[PDB]
Design a protein around this ligand. Structure first.
Ligand SMILES: [Mg+2]
Ligand SMILES: [Mg+2]
Ligand SMILES: [Mg+2]
Ligand SMILES: [Mg+2]
Ligand SMILES: [Mg+2]
Ligand SMILES: [Mg+2]
Ligand SMILES: [Mg+2]
Ligand SMILES: [Mg+2]
Length: 1310
RNA sequence: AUAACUCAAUUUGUAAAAAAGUUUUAGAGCUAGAAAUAGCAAGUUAAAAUAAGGCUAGUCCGUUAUCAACUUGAAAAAGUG
DNA sequence: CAATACCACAT
DNA sequence: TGTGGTATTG
DNA sequence: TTTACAAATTGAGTTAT
């Protein structure tokens, strides 16, 4: 009798129930509660609205951050535990004064001076050591016995802020020396062409406070005849961290683009060295050393002979220069600009020095502020120099201190320890412990050090001790933990669920893939009558001769190196492979280079060992653990080979198990899968064939070897946002089925709807850096500007036209065109992968196909460079260069057209599968599923085109009815479509030359709805004779459906979860709004948190005390239970409320009111709950469809539409009138309404288009939900909010179901 | 539709770390003046917290997902037009 | 108890 | 971007 | 901000059921 339509969105689920003739039923639903109404008429159509589901990312970031905090705290505690006794001998309450430092003097139990406990000593301390780095340097250099408190402070400062762990190994803090060395190996390599490095201040030039490229040019400038693109230039460029290409230097065909910071460099340099010889290794190694020294120079900037604490010394340098420059600046301003002195050095709000030190002004804002001040005055040259160097008035605690490796802090710490262990025995006994505190870091593969109470943890214990940084290796089983870290996420074999999947880089796996590909290769010559398979001996010969000698095997190599060389074929045609074999024996060649023993790799005896080695290299990344793991094979290789093997690492896992590939044997033949791949007589059967061959036992053994709704949906691959919509739509379906007397629908039609700036800046920066372009220096940009499409494309294309090979102009983007690579008529693609910036789209070639072969031939190399720079992707490149591959065939066109209507997205198939499995649960006599309900999936294009073709227009901003309407139209169009063409069930319904005809078929699939294109008035199916669409009275029914005033729009009520409040840590203030950041931290003294989020409001009817005499006064109000107060409130509501000051609370009348709780008042006026003290608009404006269609037409053959607009231009006043009466009845914002009316009467002179487009904006005043601001024309109208929830307390509360069909109304008069 | 492989891109989930920021306190402000106020000096650093907190007491957990109302029922979850 | 202006997040 | 919290003004 | 890892998914290809 009925079908269901569904529109699944990220914030909405549209639903509709239709009958045989495409009508939606209306029904009487019972109404519960204590009101007058016992029932209500409802149309079976509506939409569920809900806030977006969130990812788990934020939660994760905060969790991990938390752990970082507690662990840092623990580091400090370990340090204090070590210092405890001796400190107790020295200062009885040092640590106590330290711990209560935050407390006000009134709350302190000890002296207010932390370090020493008295004024004179404290002042003396700060006098001698103005910064902590002074004390650090002092404790590093001096040999005098020092106060244990200062020692502690230094060690603790180094431990609390230890620096990163991005660099492995030890660091011993030079550039001149390694430069002279570089010149040395270079000149010793190139005897004929030497370089004069006399008088070349390499230290000052390379360690300069400038960009790497500029420094490169500066260095090259001192070298006559040497250019930056030359070899030495590329070496220095390597040391500076650029991306040089050593191809041009060594006459290579393979580009030697190598970046030092890139993780693949260590193998790239081997790939390069294998081509130019091993003589050049010294050179590049030198270059790397010089690079390390350069980075260290970036951090330190202080000579190493002066002190063993270059970092602290550098900070002290910052301090001294800050002092000198401050004195200078103050004097200068005193002399020349006396009026600006107060503004600069006294006002914290003006971003001057005062704002820079005491205010919230950053270093950048401060440099921005004094820039024209320094420019205007005289004697401020060097200050400007430092300002552009970002080296002026620098603090010691700065954003760019993230460069600091932990090794140097460790160096200072070790120095201080070695210095003071001469006087304190406990420092000698605890030296390595203290060092380990700073050093130790829980491995990422171990995870949280839990004991059975963490859902995130996985680590295994080797013992039951309390884990400390010192006993970590003994208590924690690092091996089992690291193994679990990977194995808990990796797939088992689908075919053999109890079998682990092989490493992707396994030798056996690679043999499998190579043989599997090779088996389906066929060849024909002049003498043969038919292409033949490769036999076993041929495959083995090809493997041994080609696959085991070449990294990659091309077709040319197959023909010439095998078919000519072994078979004596001058000509042969190959069918199995394209250009080159996709599969390869990469690991074989890696291990061949490492161990240098081919016979060892070819020996079948060593198979297990090699598999184990590759497994070790894959499963782990820690070189130490890898080394320990490979110890059993140390007797097989030399130590050098062992270290080379150590360096070798792999990532990633296969898809199949070893037992599948080469374990299970066929019962009759005794052959494994791989055995069949190597040799299978006449029929070279595939893995797919082997797996499904009834004459073999593989299928048998595999078949023999072989989660709630919420969990199932959660386990799907996709954004949680759409997943929420999926669960919701399933629940909606369930309820609709309940509504229809538990009768299942005939059909269910489902349709599924289709920061970044930083990523864009990153892509452009790395791309330009790869390209070695100057366009970024010449044309600087901000990430916010990259939101613009043409500008982003401009930078992605290096400021060049993508079709013509010419530069473009930034100021001329408005004149340029954004062309689609593959035409939008075939591919509805809006992404960058299909868009391109060109001067004129005419220059792309023909407008019917991919850019012409002419363009492809002109721009292939440029596109190659853009590809290698990651500025364009592989897909974009292939789409750009398709013309040389025949362009778009008619089959491709037909495919595109059918894909415009047929849903291929996996997530939608999952939705359809869920629904189908929930509705169809019965089997027939042949044990086959009975499909009572057909689940149809359509794309949005069908309904959209349907709306455009029959003028059932959609305007989203008018109300939320369009979701419901979309669902309805989905049901109608879908049911009609399958009824008209039952053959198309295979395409649209879930469950189990000619291309031109297919193209035209799918291009005119929706023609049966039209009367002329010339078709009959009544459309029916040919075989059944069943009428599918009556063009005379069906559109009428649809029109009546969309014109229906009442539509069940239901805003999902949700308890608010997440952060307690705003994260902002506000200064002290006299307000009860402030929340204590800790239990005993009175926010009036210490400041604290503000703006908490209400989890859900609560209706309280009780009595409160009034006046000095506390007279009990009966009250009824809404109390917002915050997220923080929630657990306490739910543990015992009565105690909570009574603690809030309420008395005699009516427990039974306590009503939980989550956000978006619906209330109805007098004139059908509705309000939703935004909070405990704010309301939202709860009504929908059911604007008549005539006005909607008119708005659509006016805001955007065409002449008839224009004539309709001009003939019905009186509709404007009518629409304004509708909005007006609706606003007077429901919105109740007369001021804003008056502003609207006035603004409308102001721009009555404006063209109809503009007035329509601006009338569109007016609906935000009447829109359901939170009030928002909107501009009519140039008149901005601020939102009028509802800052009082008092009126709701006497209104009628409406409890709605997911569909809103079942209601319980409670008259809050009590 | 499904499977394996190649290349690339995207998305989801997890772990270990870093640099800041903020907030109170500690860095004897000096004079003149009865008084606010006036002139000048000065500033770069540190401690501590970084969701309140919890019991399971771990170098653990605390911001995702999920949620009409009623009837039951401790609870889970069923039932109700 | 209006209009109304500012704030967050920025790791 | 939004929208609920907050203080200011009145 | 950095590093390490796994899984789907899309979509251009080779081979199959
Ligand atoms: Mg804590
Ligand atoms: Mg030169
Ligand atoms: Mg600071
Ligand atoms: Mg190929
Ligand atoms: Mg590995
Ligand atoms: Mg939630
Ligand atoms: Mg800080
Ligand atoms: Mg509801």
């Amino acid at each position: 009798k009925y079908s269901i339509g569904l529109a699944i969105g990220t914030n909405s689920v549209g639903w509709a129930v239709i009958t045989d003739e495409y009508k939606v039923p209306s029904k009487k639903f019972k109404v519960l509660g204590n009101t007058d109404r016992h029932s209500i008429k409802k149309n079976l159509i509506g939409a569920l609205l809900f806030d977006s589901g969130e990812t788990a990312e934020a939660t994760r970031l905060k969790r991990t951050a938390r752990r970082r905090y507690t662990r840092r705290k623990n580091r400090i505690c370990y340090l204090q535990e070590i210092f405890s006794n001796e400190m107790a001998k020295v200062d009885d309450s040092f640590f106590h004064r330290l711990e209560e430092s935050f407390l006000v003097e009134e709350d302190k139990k000890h002296e207010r001076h932390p370090i020493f406990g008295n004024i004179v000593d404290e002042v003396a301390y700060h006098e001698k050591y103005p910064t902590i780095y002074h004390l650090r340097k002092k404790l590093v250099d001096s040999t005098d016995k020092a106060d244990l408190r200062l020692i502690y402070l230094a060690l603790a400062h180094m431990i609390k802020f230890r620096g990163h762990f991005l660099i492995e190994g030890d660091l011993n803090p030079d550039v001149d020396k390694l430069f002279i060395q570089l010149v040395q190996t270079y000149n010793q390599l190139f005897e004929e062409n030497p370089i004069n490095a006399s008088g070349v201040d390499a230290k000052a030039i390379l360690s300069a406070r400038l960009s790497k490229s500029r420094r490169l040019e500066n260095l090259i400038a001192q070298l006559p005849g040497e250019k930056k693109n030359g070899l030495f230039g590329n070496l220095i460029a390597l040391s500076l961290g650029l991306t040089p290409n050593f191809k041009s230097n060594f006459d290579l065909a393979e580009d030697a683009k190598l970046q030092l910071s890139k993780d693949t460099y260590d193998d790239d340099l081997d790939n390069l060295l294998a081509q130019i010889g091993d003589q050049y290794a010294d050179l590049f190694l030198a270059a790397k050393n010089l690079s390390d020294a350069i980075l260290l120079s970036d951090i330190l900037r202080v000579n190493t002979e002066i002190t063993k604490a270059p970092l602290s010394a550098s900070m002290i340098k910052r301090y001294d220069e800050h002092h000198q420059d401050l004195t200078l600046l103050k004097a200068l301003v005193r002399q020349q600009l006396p009026e600006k002195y107060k503004e600069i050095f006294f006002d914290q709000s003006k971003n001057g020095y005062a704002g820079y030190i005491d205010g919230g002004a950053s270093q950048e804002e401060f440099y921005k502020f004094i820039k024209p001040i320094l420019e205007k005055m005289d004697g401020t040259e060097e200050l400007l120099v430092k300002l552009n160097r970002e080296d002026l008035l620098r603090k010691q605690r700065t954003f760019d201190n993230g460069s600091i490796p932990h090794q140097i802090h460790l160096g200072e710490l070790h120095a201080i320890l070695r210095r003071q262990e001469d006087f304190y025995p406990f420092l000698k006994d605890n030296r390595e412990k203290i060092e380990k505190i700073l050093t130790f870091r829980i491995p990422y593969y171990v995870g949280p050090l839990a004991r059975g109470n963490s859902r995130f943890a996985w680590m295994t214990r080797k013992s039951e001790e309390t884990i400390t940084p010192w006993n970590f290796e003994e208590v924690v089983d690092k091996g089992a933990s690291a193994q679990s870290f990977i194995e808990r996420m990796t797939n088992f074999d689908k075919n053999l669920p109890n079998e682990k999947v092989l490493p992707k880089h396994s030798l056996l796996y690679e043999y499998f893939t190579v043989y599997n590909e090779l088996t389906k290769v066929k060849y024909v010559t002049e003498g043969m009558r038919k292409p033949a398979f490769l036999s076993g001996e041929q495959k083995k010969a090809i493997v041994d001769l080609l696959f085991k000698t070449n990294r990659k095997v091309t077709v040319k190599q197959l023909k010439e190196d095998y078919f000519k060389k072994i078979e004596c074929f001058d000509s042969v045609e190959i069918s199995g492979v394209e250009d080159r074999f996709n599969a390869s024996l990469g690991t074989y060649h890696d291990l061949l280079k490492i161990i240098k023993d081919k016979d060892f790799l070819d020996n079948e005896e060593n198979e297990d060992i090699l598999e184990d080695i590759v497994l070790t290299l894959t499963l782990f990344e820690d070189r130490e653990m890898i080394e320990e793991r490979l110890k059993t094979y140390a007797h097989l290789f030399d130590d050098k080979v062992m270290k080379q093997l150590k360096r070798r690492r792999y990532t990633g896992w296969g898809r199949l198990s070893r037992k599948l590939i080469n374990g299970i044997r066929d019962k009759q033949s005794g052959k494994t899968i791989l055995d069949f791949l190597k040799s299978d007589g006449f029929a070279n059967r595939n893995f797919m064939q082997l797996i499904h061959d009834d004459s073999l036992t593989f299928k048998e053994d595999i078949q023999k070897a072989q989660d709630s709704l919420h969990e199932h949906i959660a386990n799907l691959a996709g954004s949680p946002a759409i997943k929420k919509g999926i669960l919701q739509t399933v629940k909606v379906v369930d309820e609709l089925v309940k509504v229809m007397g538990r009768h299942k629908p005939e059909n269910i039609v489902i349709e599924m709807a289709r920061k970044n700036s930083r990523e864009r800046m990153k892509r452009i920066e790395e791309g330009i850096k790869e390209l070695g372009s100057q366009i970024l220096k010449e044309h600087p940009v901000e990430n916010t500007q990259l939101q613009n499409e043409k500008l982003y494309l401009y930078y992605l294309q290096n400021g060049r036209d993508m079709y013509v090979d010419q530069e473009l102009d930034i100021n001329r983007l408005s004149d340029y065109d954004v062309d689609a690579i593959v035409p939008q008529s075939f591919l509805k693609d809006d992404s960058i992968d299909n868009k391109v910036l060109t001067r004129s789209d005419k220059n792309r070639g023909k407008s019917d196909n991919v850019p012409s072969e002419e363009v492809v031939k002109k721009m292939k190399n440029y596109w190659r460079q853009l590809l290698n720079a990651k500025l364009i992707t592989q897909r974009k490149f292939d789409n750009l260069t398709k013309a040389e591959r025949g362009g778009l065939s008619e089959l491709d066109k037909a495919g595109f057209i059918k894909r415009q209507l047929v849903e291929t997205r996996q997530i939608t198939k999952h939705v359809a599968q869920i629904l189908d499995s929930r509705m169809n649960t019965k089997y027939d006599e042949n044990d086959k599923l009975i499909r009572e309900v057909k689940v149809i999936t359509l794309k949005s294009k069908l309904v959209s085109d349907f709306r455009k073709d029959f003028q059932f227009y959609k305007v989203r901003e008018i109300n939320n009815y369009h979701h419901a309407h979309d669902a309805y139209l989905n049901a109608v169009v879908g049911t009609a479509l399958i009824k008209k063409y039952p053959k198309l069930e295979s395409e649209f319904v879930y469950g189990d030359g000619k291309a031109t005809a297919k193209y035209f078929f799918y291009s005119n699939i929706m023609n049966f709805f039209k009367t002329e294109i010339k078709r009959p008035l009544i459309e029916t199916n040919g075989e059944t004779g069943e009428i599918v669409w009556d063009k005379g009275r069906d559109f009428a029914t649809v029109r009546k459906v969309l014109s229906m005033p009442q539509v069940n729009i239901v805003k999902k009520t949700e308890v608010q979860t997440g952060g307690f409040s705003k994260e902002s840590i506000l200064p002290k203030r006299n307000s009860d709004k402030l929340i204590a950041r800790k239990k005993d931290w009175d926010p009036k003294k210490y400041g604290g948190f503000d703006s908490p989020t209400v989890a859900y409001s609560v209706l309280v009817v009780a009595k409160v005390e009034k006046g000095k005499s506390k007279k009990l006064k009966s009250v009824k109000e809404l109390l917002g239970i915050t997220i923080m107060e929630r657990s306490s409130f739910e543990k015992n509501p009565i105690d909570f409320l009574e603690a809030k000051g309420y008395k005699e609370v009516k427990k039974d009348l306590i009503i939980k009111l989550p956000k978006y709780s619906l209330f109805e008042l007098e004139n059908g006026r509705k309000r939703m709950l935004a909070s405990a003290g704010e309301l939202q608009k709860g009504n929908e404006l059911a604007l008549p469809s005539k006005y909607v269609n008119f708005l659509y037409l006016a805001s955007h053959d065409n002449e008839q539409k224009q004539l309709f607009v001009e003939q019905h231009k009186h509709y404007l006043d009518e629409i304004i009138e509708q909005i007006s009466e609706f606003s007077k009845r429901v919105i109740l914002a007369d001021a804003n309404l008056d502003k609207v009316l006035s603004a409308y009467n102001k721009h009555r002179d404006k063209p109809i288009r503009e007035q329509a487009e601006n009338i569109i904006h007016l609906f935000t005043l009447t829109n359901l939900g939170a009030p928002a601001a909107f501009k009519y024309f140039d008149t901005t109208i601020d939102r009028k909010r509802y800052t009082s929830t008092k009126e709701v307390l006497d209104a009628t509360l409406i409890h709605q179901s997911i569909t809103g069909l079942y209601e319980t109304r409670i008259d809050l008069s009590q």
